[PDB]
Design a protein around this ligand. Structure first.
Ligand code: HEM
Ligand code: HEM
Lengths: 172, 168
């Protein structure tokens, strides 16, 4: 689903308030994500054993990713008026994560959900249905473009996904 | 290993050697891992010492209290953006056209949209180097100082060339 102009401008304004604290917000997002989904830490050699969120917050590798994530998303959000630019930015991010980092797409789905949870909580006083819908669309946009990029490089998404163990007595 | 005369030129060059690049990249990564706090500290130091530079920022140009400046969303957003753009430069120092493309974009935007006097780039870069020198005072033999001096000169030379290109 495509953002209307009003939806775009709402997201852009809300996002700019987050980006003014780019690292505190990115770190909060990532820590919440890793605490809730420790399997996602597998990709990060320097914090894959960390359990304590206080320790995670101070991990340089985590913090660098937090800063890079916020920068990349900032480029997306500032350019939402330019669909072709949005597509190119997310295609680069997607292809890098598919090919260099080999990240399971499930982690993009999940992280995008965490971002939305953090926004809904940070802006709970200012989050009516119109604004909720705008952010939901942005989540969809991010995941859609990233998965398209994975498909383009030949990642074949499976149902059940690739990580799920086999049923001992399956059914069709 | 180059000839002596080519070494003499590498010393005055714009471009960082592989050894200089790796030094800068390693040290920079420590700063970028604290992108927000470092960027904000850099800008607040800059504006306190160079209040004339505040003029370009419509939402904090009137502020004299450094505590208020520090909390200004416009200042903080710029701090994050500066750190992101510099990070792109440092990570791509091996690729001169990528460095040039990032710094041309920045330079032309600041010349044309923001109408910033180019000297402020020289000044701000200086402040970045001060903050680096403070963070790393032990890991800093003369060659390491020189590597950062070259980065500063590289940034300013690219930006000034972008200003000239757009007819500043
Ligand atoms: C909104 C979603 C995300 C964005 C915008 C994003 C963006 C970035 C960027 C810009 C970089 C640096 C350039 C590069 O090395 O490719 C990066 C690196 C990386 N990303 Fe992401 N990322 C996202 C989600 C994820 C997820 C879900 C994972 C795994 C759970 C992940 C794992 C990694 C890893 C392992 C690196 C390399 C880290 C390192 O070298 O220290 N990313 N990401
Ligand atoms: C390392 C040097 C610098 C870098 C890498 C840098 C980078 C950036 C970037 C990426 C943006 C956002 C995109 C844009 O609007 O152009 C920006 C905006 C801006 N920059 Fe810089 N900048 C630097 C130095 C300066 C200096 C020295 C000044 C003035 C003293 C300045 C004034 C501005 C202004 C006024 C904006 C627009 C801010 C807004 O609309 O909220 N910048 N800069």
């Amino acid at each position: 689903e495509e953002l209307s102009e009003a939806e775009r401008k709402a997201v852009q304004a809300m996002w700019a308030r987050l980006y003014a604290n780019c690292e505190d917000v990115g770190v909060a997002i990532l820590v919440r994500f890793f605490v809730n989904f420790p399997s996602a830490k597998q990709y990060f050699s320097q914090f894959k054993h960390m359990e304590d969120p206080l320790e995670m917050e101070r991990s340089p590798q985590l913090r660098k990713h937090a800063c890079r994530v916020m920068g990349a998303l900032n480029t997306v959000v500032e350019n939402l008026h330019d669909p072709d630019k949005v597509s190119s930015v997310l295609a680069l991010v997607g292809k890098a994560h598919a090919l260099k980092h080999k990240v399971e797409p499930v982690y993009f789905k999940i992280l995008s959900g965490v971002i939305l949870e953090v926004v809904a909580e940070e802006f709970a006083s200012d989050f009516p249905p119109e604004t909720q819908r705008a952010w939901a669309k942005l989540r969809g946009l991010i995941y859609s473009h990233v998965t398209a990029a994975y498909k383009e490089v030949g990642w074949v998404q499976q149902v059940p996904n690739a990580t799920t163990p086999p049923a001992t007595l399956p059914s069709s």
